[PDB]
Amino acid sequence: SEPSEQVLDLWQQADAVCFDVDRTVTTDASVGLLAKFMGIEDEAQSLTEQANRGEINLTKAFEDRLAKLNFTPTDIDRFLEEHPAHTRLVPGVENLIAALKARGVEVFLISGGFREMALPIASHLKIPAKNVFCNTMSWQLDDHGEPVRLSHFKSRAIERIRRKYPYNNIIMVGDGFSDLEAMQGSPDGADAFICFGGVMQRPAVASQADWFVRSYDELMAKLKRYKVTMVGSGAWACTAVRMVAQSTAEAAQLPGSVFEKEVTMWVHEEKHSGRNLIEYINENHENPIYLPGIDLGENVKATSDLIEAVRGADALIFCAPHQFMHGICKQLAAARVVGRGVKAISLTKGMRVRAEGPQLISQMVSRILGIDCSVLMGANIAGDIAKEELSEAVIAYANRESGSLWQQLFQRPYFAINLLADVPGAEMCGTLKNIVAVGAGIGDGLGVGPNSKASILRQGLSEMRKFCKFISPSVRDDTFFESCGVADLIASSYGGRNRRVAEAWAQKRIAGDDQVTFEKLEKEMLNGQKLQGVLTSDEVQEILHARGWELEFPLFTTINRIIHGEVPPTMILRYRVACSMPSMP
Amino acid sequence: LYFQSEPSEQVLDLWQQADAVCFDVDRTVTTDASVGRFLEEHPAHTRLVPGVENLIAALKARGVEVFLISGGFREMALPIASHLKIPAKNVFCNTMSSHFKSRAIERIRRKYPYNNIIMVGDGFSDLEAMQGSPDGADAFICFGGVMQRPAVASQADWFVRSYDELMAKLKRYKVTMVGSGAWACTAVRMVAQSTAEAAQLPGSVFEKEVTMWVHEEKHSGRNLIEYINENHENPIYLPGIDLGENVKATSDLIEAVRGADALIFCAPHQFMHGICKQLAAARVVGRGVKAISLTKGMRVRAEGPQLISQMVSRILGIDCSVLMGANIAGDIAKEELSEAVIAYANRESGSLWQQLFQRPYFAINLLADVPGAEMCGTLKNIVAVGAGIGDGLGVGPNSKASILRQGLSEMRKFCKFISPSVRDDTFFESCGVADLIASSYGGRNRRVAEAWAQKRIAGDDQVTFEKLEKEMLNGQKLQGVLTSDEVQEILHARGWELEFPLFTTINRIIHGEVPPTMILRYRVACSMPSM
Numbered sequence A: 001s002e003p004s005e006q007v008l009d010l011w012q013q014a015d016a017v018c019f020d021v022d023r024t025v026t027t028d029a030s031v032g033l034l035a036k037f038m039g040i041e042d043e044a045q046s047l048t049e050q051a052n053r054g055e056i057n058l059t060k061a062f063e064d065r066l067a068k069l070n071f072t073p074t075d076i077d078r079f080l081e082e083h084p085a086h087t088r089l090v091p092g093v094e095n096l097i098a099a100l101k102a103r104g105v106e107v108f109l110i111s112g113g114f115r116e117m118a119l120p121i122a123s124h125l126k127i128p129a130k131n132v133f134c135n136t137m138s139w140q141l142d143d144h145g146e147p148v149r150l151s152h153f154k155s156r157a158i159e160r161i162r163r164k165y166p167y168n169n170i171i172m173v174g175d176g177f178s179d180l181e182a183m184q185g186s187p188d189g190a191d192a193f194i195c196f197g198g199v200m201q202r203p204a205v206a207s208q209a210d211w212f213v214r215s216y217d218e219l220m221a222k223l224k225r226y227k228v229t230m231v232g233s234g235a236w237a238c239t240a241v242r243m244v245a246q247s248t249a250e251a252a253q254l255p256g257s258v259f260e261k262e263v264t265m266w267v268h269e270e271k272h273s274g275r276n277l278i279e280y281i282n283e284n285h286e287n288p289i290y291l292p293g294i295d296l297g298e299n300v301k302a303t304s305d306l307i308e309a310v311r312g313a314d315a316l317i318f319c320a321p322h323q324f325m326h327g328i329c330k331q332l333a334a335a336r337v338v339g340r341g342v343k344a345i346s347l348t349k350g351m352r353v354r355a356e357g358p359q360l361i362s363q364m365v366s367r368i369l370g371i372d373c374s375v376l377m378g379a380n381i382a383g384d385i386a387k388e389e390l391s392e393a394v395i396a397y398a399n400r401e402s403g404s405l406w407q408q409l410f411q412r413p414y415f416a417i418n419l420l421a422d423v424p425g426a427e428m429c430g431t432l433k434n435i436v437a438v439g440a441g442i443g444d445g446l447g448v449g450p451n452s453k454a455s456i457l458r459q460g461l462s463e464m465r466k467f468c469k470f471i472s473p474s475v476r477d478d479t480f481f482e483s484c485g486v487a488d489l490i491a492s493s494y495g496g497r498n499r500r501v502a503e504a505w506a507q508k509r510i511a512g513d514d515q516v517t518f519e520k521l522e523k524e525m526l527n528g529q530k531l532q533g534v535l536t537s538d539e540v541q542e543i544l545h546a547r548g549w550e551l552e553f554p555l556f557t558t559i560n561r562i563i564h565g566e567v568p569p570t571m572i573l574r575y576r577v578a579c580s581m582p583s584m585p
Numbered sequence B: 001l002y003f004q005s006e007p008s009e010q011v012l013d014l015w016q017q018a019d020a021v022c023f024d025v026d027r028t029v030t031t032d033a034s035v036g037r038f039l040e041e042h043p044a045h046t047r048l049v050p051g052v053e054n055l056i057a058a059l060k061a062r063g064v065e066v067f068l069i070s071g072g073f074r075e076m077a078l079p080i081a082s083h084l085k086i087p088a089k090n091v092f093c094n095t096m097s098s099h100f101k102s103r104a105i106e107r108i109r110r111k112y113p114y115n116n117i118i119m120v121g122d123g124f125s126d127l128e129a130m131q132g133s134p135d136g137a138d139a140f141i142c143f144g145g146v147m148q149r150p151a152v153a154s155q156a157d158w159f160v161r162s163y164d165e166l167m168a169k170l171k172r173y174k175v176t177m178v179g180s181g182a183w184a185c186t187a188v189r190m191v192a193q194s195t196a197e198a199a200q201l202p203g204s205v206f207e208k209e210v211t212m213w214v215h216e217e218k219h220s221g222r223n224l225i226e227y228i229n230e231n232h233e234n235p236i237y238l239p240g241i242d243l244g245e246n247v248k249a250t251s252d253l254i255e256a257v258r259g260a261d262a263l264i265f266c267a268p269h270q271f272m273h274g275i276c277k278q279l280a281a282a283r284v285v286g287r288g289v290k291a292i293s294l295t296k297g298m299r300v301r302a303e304g305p306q307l308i309s310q311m312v313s314r315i316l317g318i319d320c321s322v323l324m325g326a327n328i329a330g331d332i333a334k335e336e337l338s339e340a341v342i343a344y345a346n347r348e349s350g351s352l353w354q355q356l357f358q359r360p361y362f363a364i365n366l367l368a369d370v371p372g373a374e375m376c377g378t379l380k381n382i383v384a385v386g387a388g389i390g391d392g393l394g395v396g397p398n399s400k401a402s403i404l405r406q407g408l409s410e411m412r413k414f415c416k417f418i419s420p421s422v423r424d425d426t427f428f429e430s431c432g433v434a435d436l437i438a439s440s441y442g443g444r445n446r447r448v449a450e451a452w453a454q455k456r457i458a459g460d461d462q463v464t465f466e467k468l469e470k471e472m473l474n475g476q477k478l479q480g481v482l483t484s485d486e487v488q489e490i491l492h493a494r495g496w497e498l499e500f501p502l503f504t505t506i507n508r509i510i511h512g513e514v515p516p517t518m519i520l521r522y523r524v525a526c527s528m529p530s531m
């Protein structure tokens, strides 16, 4: 009894697990349990072997036991009552099937027996009839349904499943030869056969099995359990880890939890607080600097060592101010601590300029760490979500398997998640919208009214759209209508830090203060938190200058020219003109 | 055998219906002939005949294709054509190393869809542009400024000594505004700015005076009209603001419209049907009239939406454009930079309306998509009401942005269900996203909706939107609640209520069925049991 390298992988990376009914899910075989109650035991048991059903004449047990009858529907009703399909299940199998479904593995029953027997078992395990592959008895039916009785089954059923669903790794779990057949018959069959000899062993079928087990807690305990590490500890990082921590605490209250209960959070050490910050977080479950008054749960564990935070981690969340991200990825690469099977997601907004082009955080993680990286982008001002005000976000998945994991991790009753395939569109919207929020706040600082502010947003959204098409034409218009697009741009233009600081900057510039800078105000206003829109403005302007697109994006350009003092703030609604106008003295 | 003094009425009509006008260069566009590589065209604006620059601009302003047909030298004429914004391809002329003009006009008739073509010139070559072919000019206007040649003048359908005479017979539109509320007045103020500017030149596309129908109310209307005409200001709906000196108010709907070549409809939408029936019955709106609607809101017809532009077309028998954008009236009235879309019935009208509405502080974008821009303008007010409800609950910016995201989403979905022709690009225009944002943070529907929800939650459930409209709005009308009711009738007819859970939640909140606090939980609220 023991597994094997790439088999264990297939079990852990499974997209669907198919269970045989008779003697893998049920303690007793159906045909015989039905023989008793029907008093034909030995007539049956004289059919249930290999001197009869070992070659037979032209029939197997199921097909033949059916032939034996003068038997009526009210009888099948009775029997299912005498043996309620909850008394019939091998211990540990309900817990195993529940665990699989809880992490999005689809579960099938595939049986060579009677449908009328498998469906109550399916109903009990929460498996839909849609997922039960099993022939019915031949019933005469009439004009509603059911007065009186009138090879390669499992490999073929697996072939149909494979053509119907986006599943690539499909496992067969069973005791008989029909189950072994599920893999051996045809190449599009099961990718692995696990033989369950908990009820009946069967040395000949166990021998060609990919894995032989006696208990289901043998399978359960080889289910992957993801350890989660949050890389970052700012305002949004902490309210994020707080939501993520609530999910794992929920998942660990059930047997086959897909997540470790404890979430690790890397906290960058700052000179003015040193080690005391980390210790405060672990003792009081609060980041009192970046998210004061908010209880990160009791299952959040802070550490200041980046390598140690990451080493055990199966699920990495990247959420740090974007100017730091390149250095953070370079450190993790050098340490060789990120296994290539690790799932990553980025919550970060901002980009690096590379080869005269945009590199978003998710592209940075993939290129440098060699792993796939999803994103979570939405209208998400942290402080309010930390207080559990209703909010929403898009998760754009690198591939569909990731999406399911991330959604289970991040979705809370106050934080609704929408899965999208468009990672380049979500991510570029999340990043570019902070430029527009700077423009929006320069507007506010000027005093402009709702009509004019709406113009800045309209033009901003239209240029986000255009830039997305200039750089990744795959991007779908639909994406701008989701939470990562128009929702985020609005919340950030009316309630974000970029708007807030840019308003103050523009008020001061107008009043004569020609020396005030965004860097100074960031220090003065944001209490350690990081301004992202002006950095993003410069990053994009670098790309615009390089590609000669300064006039293709007039609002982006006049916002940068205003930040850097070539155009006066008052020209913000005059972008069509301010983008090309000669600089001021 | 004298010069044709006044043209013959057929000729007059042909002038106004011209698709293209062809000018001779020598002695009709320029005062001189030629004479004198190198290429020292020393001037080219001192060459010009008075009025011709004004005339050619006035023709272009009317969509008339202008050409140069010269028996002289091309390199000599290109500079003229450039100054006059006539592309090189519209200059028919020889280089430097006979039926020439009628031959050139035959080409034009083959390469363009122009059927009415007029020749303007001084010489015999210009006369032959009409006479020398059954496919030549349809009329010949002889220009006797510079050179008076009686042989050419005796022939020719029209003789003039000054281009002023031609410019006076160009089509000229008389504009009346149907409506006199806040937005109609600030609209009228902009329009009158444009006609006053245009009327400073000889061949103005617009008559200077703009007429405004001011509906008479029982409370204050016997001298309203007189106050407006003498003080140039609507003190009830737009106090403090100078409508132009060229705005004339009347309370007679039919006579306001009787003279009018260009109609602007901008009255609260609940009265537009009636207004349309009356003008139809008075038989005062001719099939030639140009119409544009600024009204947001709909009428339910055949349990489908009828938007105001459709109402105008069906009932008055004319095409109707629309102007839609993020246009809170008070700020535009004060000349704060703003933007709008004009979705045009046809490109020709779109051009006319842009000349009328566009101001240095009010930029216009032309768009072919009328059903999209108009349905956005109408649906936006529903979401604004939901936004105001969230505001009255103290909902934060994440949460309000969800209302707007779901709102915009349902706007786009309803648009496509009703009019599959609507292009996605339309929602990114000022009529879509911009207007929904402006009105969700700064509009009347947001404000009243806010006051309403504040009072509800604070325990007053006798308060009504009608009450608040009366108390808060000073005569002005609340379009968001009416439009929510209109859409909801359509939703209930087509079984769409759950297809649009935010719309449904908003309507159920407005009436007593769902508590205001459920606004962020619309997905569940749309179908939850009442109370």
Ligand SMILES: NC(=O)c1ccc[n+]([C@@H]2O[C@H](COP(=O)([O-])OP(=O)(O)OC[C@H]3O[C@@H](n4cnc5c(N)ncnc54)[C@H](O)[C@@H]3O)[C@@H](O)[C@H]2O)c1
Residues within 6 Å of the ligand: A232, A233, A234, A235, A236, A237, A238, A267, A268, A269, A290, A319, A320, A321, A322, A324, A347, A348, A349, A350, A380, A381, A382, A383, A528, A529, A530, A531, A532
């Ligand atoms: N705050 C929000 O409401 C919000 C919402 C959505 C997305 N975001 C995005 O999340 C990302 C991070 O935001 P945040 O709110 O978690 O951070 P933050 O703005 O709160 O910044 C504070 C963090 O900066 C860290 N820091 C300071 N110097 C550092 C250094 N040299 N190296 C590494 N870290 C350093 C500090 O450890 C601190 O934790 C940003 O890209 C932001 O655009 C923020």
Ligand SMILES: NC(=O)c1ccc[n+]([C@@H]2O[C@H](COP(=O)([O-])OP(=O)(O)OC[C@H]3O[C@@H](n4cnc5c(N)ncnc54)[C@H](O)[C@@H]3O)[C@@H](O)[C@H]2O)c1
Residues within 6 Å of the ligand: B179, B180, B181, B182, B183, B184, B185, B214, B215, B216, B217, B237, B266, B267, B268, B269, B271, B294, B295, B296, B297, B327, B328, B329, B330, B475, B476, B477, B478, B479
């Ligand atoms: N106010 C804005 O900022 C704004 C901006 C853009 C679009 N709009 C839309 O354009 C229209 C604007 O209307 P408004 O702002 O010009 O008007 P308003 O709401 O300011 O005033 C109400 C008007 O209703 C008139 N009226 C006509 N027939 C009437 C009748 N039988 N009974 C009572 N009153 C009658 C009254 O004379 C009065 O002038 C609306 O459809 C609106 O949705 C308004």
Ligand SMILES: [Mg+2]
Residues within 6 Å of the ligand: A020, A021, A022, A023, A024, A174, A175, A176
């Ligand atoms: Mg079996």
Ligand SMILES: [Mg+2]
Residues within 6 Å of the ligand: B024, B025, B026, B027, B028, B121, B122, B123
């Ligand atoms: Mg001549």
